[PDB]
Recover the amino acids of this structure.
């Protein structure tokens, strides 16, 4: 406990918190989705409710340490409030996202951070054809709300959504689930915009 | 990181926070709406739910800096809690507004602030005739709750609501969406009152 | 900005906050209601939902200042959290009251405070007869939760509820709306209890 | 104001807050209920919703003062957050309790505290027979969550629930409402467990 | 009070809070469930709502004291916010868990902590066959969100869920309720992961 108390004190009480990335010091954020369930489909409002884990990874030099100086500690768990976290948001939500898991991150000695919030999301989705064999496709983009591709570079490790934890007795069957990194440019702005498009093809089980 | 940490420290930890505008030092707030969806229409209570982005822009001398003194930083992102924000509100909401995005603003070296909260709004709207070709018109005024025209001047860049992000498979089709700055004079009071009237004409797709 | 920053610092950072009134130093609170809408009526639970502005006015010697000493500032806007506010409550609510507006007050150099929260209230009301020409009458009392008339004296400027902002396409038509100051004494206790009785007669439009 | 500011400073800023009772220094908490309304009955989930005032009284030596030393102040009102409050809870609630009133307590010079929160409670109750003349009986136990009878001596003043404020046009009529205290010892443990069983017999009006 | 004030000050104001367990200093957390009611079953979304008490026990050397040095105090009650608590979560919830009880723990002089939060949980469960004699089986895993078996060792005192407080007039009858410790391994990671699988077999009463 003494070595970990010392490490946390040196990392969090000595210097001000990381102020976020800039064009000169960009940050790469890796996103991955683990879809657990399609909990609700509302055909009268065109809202669909998903339960998923959103894996977020990034690396900060300010979070690095030599394990030899701290009783061979290679990683620790800490409240996500103690650290800077990226402002990754769903771009077409209809309700505030509901957090289903403790807000705790894992920090590794190389400065790597892994934060996996479990969430319930209501987003814009026309479910017409969900009761058919072909099913229905719905998509929701995720990205930084305030940082462009010049400050936050969004990435995925795979374009395949993790369906290994998908509820087997769900009302809905997943035909396909992909997470695709997209780089967009708008007429307004010279900076690129990055999002991860979560595309889910599903039908009634 | 060091230059941004220094900038934020100089802007936020040296002087007290901006106390808001006065008649002697008025502030101009530019409002713009990006309508995403008409998520719900309730004909039994006369409530309509909107999902939109509300772009807010203002400029403070106290937020200015010389980029040359701070490693050529021309702008940064910071929690909206670190800065003063205008008390812009819907004058005919029926439920507290639901924030759908991170509460983060972009501050530019010229003292400009851009704050774009995504919101879900429930407001007073009689949807009689939504199921017709003519559709229905509904309006909601936005403005400062406590500041008159003498302290906060409200403006728009365009009278046209941005409909380029409007949900393509929405239950409702937008016939027209305008955002108009209105000035109101009362016999009682010498001070003018300013609002932005969001007028949306819509029908069932 | 500098003069207002100085004023706020002198009023709020020099002395402890106003500890509320006492029998020796009573406070008069003026109440006024502006009814915007009867949003929902529930005949299965006997609950009615109102949307209104509740104007609250009081005066504190501790909030007084000479405008000449502060660059001729005669009033300012401040977060209601910076000041003491009366504990005015609805005595027959069925749900926690929902705040629809920014929590900001206007302080005048004579020590006057004006606080106008917009609220959504669910209260006990049998709506039987709302669908008739005669309509239905419903009442809700407002007053201090913990202070008697010896500490907080409630007053009204008028017995007429402001209906000039009442939603013209509401499901309900207002036949009459009054706000009356009422006094009561209990056998135990000598102190009077004050409430403002909001009586609304309404029917379906 | 000055004398009350001085009193509050002496009571709350000089010594640490009361750490709660112990076996060596037990505390008597007097509990009583004022039933306002049976708002809802749900026969599909077996949940009943009550609106009531829960009167809590206790006395602390650390909250005592000589009125002569403080401008003859015999009592004051303060935020329930400034003082220790007992952890009295419903043992069979189905939803978090909703607070309908300001969280303010009355402290008397003898160290007496009176705290009367208004609340909405959903609790386990089978309402089968509510639509009959006989009605239905439902019960909810209240007590300390973590303190035994050795630390918190939970008491009542009367076994009769105050029905003098019960909503006259409620959907439900009260046939009887009692608050019976119970002291129990289990074979495991030497300490008594105390609870108050709020028993309400009611039917449709 | 003085001895307890002194004890709390020595335990909580002298050293930094316990930073959580590590591989070198693991922690055993014992979990136990007391099922109170199956409040709701939703066959359209496949969600079931449970009301239960979750007993959590763990032991910290940093929470030890000699009762002889503190007026023979052998245990005390304190806000769960004053101490470190394990991040035990339901792995298949569909809504944020609702806390129904005060967040207070019991600390014993041997460093033992007992924390029993009452909760309402919505979780993934297909209730098809609940209206039959055979009933339906539903399961929910609980475990640490961020810690492995190397840091938090989860244990049970019994595999039998406590049904002695189960609501007698519930819509649902419990056929069986077990809580089983399970050790899992993931392809990513060499460390074992522990969960407690709450398996409830139930039917309509
Ligand atoms: C966040 C944290 C834990 C989980 C777990 C899922 C399965 N195990 C743990 C299995 C587990 C996943 C996992 C994902 C990335 C890296 C390491 C990981 N270990 C218990 C909780 C889910 C989301
Ligand atoms: C309001 C409007 C769009 C957004 C974005 C939605 C898609 N992108 C990039 C699209 C985008 C245009 C744009 C115009 C002005 C300022 C920021 C902007 N971001 C990232 C955030 C956030 C808030
Ligand atoms: C609380 C509740 C509602 C408001 C206003 C409602 C409509 N207007 C301006 C309408 C308005 C005239 C007027 C005349 C004298 C004093 C205050 C006044 N407000 C802007 C906001 C402000 C604060
Ligand atoms: C708890 C319970 C009710 C209230 C009130 C609701 C109606 N009154 C009546 C207030 C009131 C009666 C009374 C009778 C005997 C002794 C003290 C009393 N206070 C003012 C506030 C406030 C706090
Ligand atoms: C967590 C879970 C339940 C409770 C209680 C439920 C019922 N009682 C009596 C609680 C109670 C019996 C009992 C019997 C033997 C040993 C210890 C015991 N505690 C008071 C609160 C408190 C905290």
């Amino acid at each position: 406990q003494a070595n970990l108390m010392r490490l946390k004190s040196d990392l969090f009480n000595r210097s001000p918190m990381y102020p976020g990335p800039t064009k000169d010091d960009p940050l790469t954020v890796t996103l991955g989705f683990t879809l657990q369930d399609i909990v609700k489909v509302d055909s009268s409002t065109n809202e669909v409710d998903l339960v998923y884990y959103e894996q977020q990874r990034w690396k900060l030099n300010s979070l690095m340490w030599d394990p030899n100086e701290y009783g061979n500690i290679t990683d620790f768990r800490t409240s996500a409030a103690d650290i800077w976290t990226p402002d990754i948001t769903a771009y077409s939500s209809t309700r505030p996202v509901q957090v289903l898991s403790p807000q705790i991150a894992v920090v590794t000695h190389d400065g790597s951070v892994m934060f996996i919030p479990a969430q319930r999301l209501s987003f814009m989705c026309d479910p017409t054809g969900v009761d058919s064999e072909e099913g229905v496709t719905c998509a929701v983009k995720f990205g930084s709300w305030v940082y462009s591709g010049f400050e936050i570079d969004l990435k995925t490790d795979t374009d395949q959504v993790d369906l290994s934890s998908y509820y087997a007795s769900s009302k809905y069957e997943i035909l396909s689930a992909t997470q695709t990194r997209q780089v967009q440019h708008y007429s307004c702005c010279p900076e690129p915009y990055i999002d991860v498009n979560l595309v889910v093809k599903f039908r009634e089980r």
In short: Chain E touches chain A at residues 15-16, 18-20, 22, 24-25, 44-47, 62, 87, 89-90, 92-97, 124-126, 145-147, 151 (CB under 8 Å).
